[PDB]
């Protein structure tokens with residue numbers, strides 16, 4: 312039991328980011344008052360970071376306390392599923408606490424949970440079963456407290472929830488198709504195939520509904536396979552954009568050949584809650600871009616049109632991670648009652664070579680300026696209001712201020728590079744948002760880029776630096792920033808699980824990736840120092 316002075320020193324340690332490396336001096340203090348810290352749920356993660364698991368007595372002593380401790384939070388168990396831990400009892404404990412989460416929260420961490428399998432017992436996975444095997448053909452070729460591992464648990468929940476089933480499927484499918492993994496880590500590629508085999512197996516074993524989930528996934532797999540075959544053809548067609556589009560619509564029209572315009576209701580892999588009847592052949596076109604991506608309009612169950620960007624010949628995993636993080640950041644912000652009107656549009660890689668994107672009706676800021684002159688002109692044209700600020704609907708102005716603040720902070724934390732008016736989009740409802748996340752975590756095609764993604768034209772849109780709207784922008788920025796800092800351990804743990812994913816800007820320096828995010832939070836500052844720090848970044852970016 313420690314004195315009043317020691318307790319403060321322990322508290323400094325317990326409050327540390329999950330990433331920060333514990334000094335020997337710190338390691339010994341935690342090791343000493345380990346029976347004291349038992350009632351501190353947040354200290355358990357700092358305790359298991361002291362232990363040298365290579366030492367049986369130290370490992371054994373550590374596990375006794377793990378049973379005695381105040382049960383860990385769901386957000387903190389993600390720490391135990393990283394590469395830092397190899398102890399089966401620890402990894403089993405993470406899963407045991409992770410089971411406390413509901414499916415909504417699980418989906419939030421699913422991309423990372425799939426990556427965490429890379430640190431699981433590959434043999435234990437293989438035992439669960441009852442180049443040679445093609446992963447894409449597993450589901451399409453059906454054959455006539457601390458007990459569960461990560462693999463068992465995910466599969467278990469995936470069989471009860473169709474939304475999880477879908478993302479579990481496509482996440483694991485993309486891991487299986489990873490060439491770098493096949494080449495450099497064959498035993499990992501072999502694990503993912505076995506995860507996919509265990510999944511197909513568990514679904515086949517299920518009730519009427521679970522057996523249909525498997526056919527649905529096969530239908531989805533088959534549909535994607537045909538859309539790829541159509542894409543390869545369109546990308547190959549000799550001619551101009553008009554020639555390739557006519558080929559695109561011709562093949563989409565040919566339902567007997569291609570089977571893409573009229574299909575039995577199947578969930579959209581991108582967003583499974585949306586079921587689709589097929590693709591409208593006549594509204595399909597390629598974007599001007601040299602990668603030849605297509606704009607395809609899906610026919611939904613209840614009469615809607617769901618536009619997608621389907622890319623073939625590009626890896627969508629970086630963009631996929633960023634949009635799932637923006638979606639998480641938006642969810643925590645909303646949780647803290649701060650809806651900043653963000654566009655966390657869906658992105659799903661259906662392979663390392665292709666994937667889907669949720670298309671949002673929007674206009675690039677560049678176009679807005681080159682057609683209407685200003686953001687305020689655009690807004691007066693589509694949302695005029697006499698009583699409103701600068702002749703614009705207050706709702707639209709409120710949406711504009713909120714989304715600008717939200718994206719300023721989010722793109723600041725994620726170190727989003729290559730920012731230009733062509734990859735900043737506006738909606739007639741006042742929604743501002745970012746697209747194309749090719750450069751993140753401090754990368755940029757140009758050297759020494761600004762830490763904040765602001766400009767003259769963005770502020771002009773609010774009514775300039777002297778407006779009431781400009782004050783509210785600053786207020787929203789530093790409010791959003793304080794909130795996101797409150798979930799720094801959750802964000803940092805999720806990024807901790809992304810180090811061994813083949814995401815270009817993470818692959819570049821895995822060992823230094825999480826510190827890049829950690830440093831943006833400026834956890835060294837108090838919330839008041841943080842609020843002033845955020846104002847300095849905003850002011851400097853605007854004045855420059």
Ligand SMILES: C[C@@H]1COC[C@@H](C)N1c1cc(=O)n2c(n1)N(Cc1ccc(Cl)s1)[C@H](C(F)(F)F)CC2
Nearest residue numbers: 598600604620656668669670671673675746747748
């Ligand atoms: C899916 C999202 C959200 O909804 C709107 C849309 C902008 N979007 C994105 C995201 C994204 O990464 N890109 C694109 N559109 N277009 C860029 C543009 C497409 C349409 C424009 Cl207008 S500007 C091209 C691509 F063709 F290669 F994909 C370059 C990359």
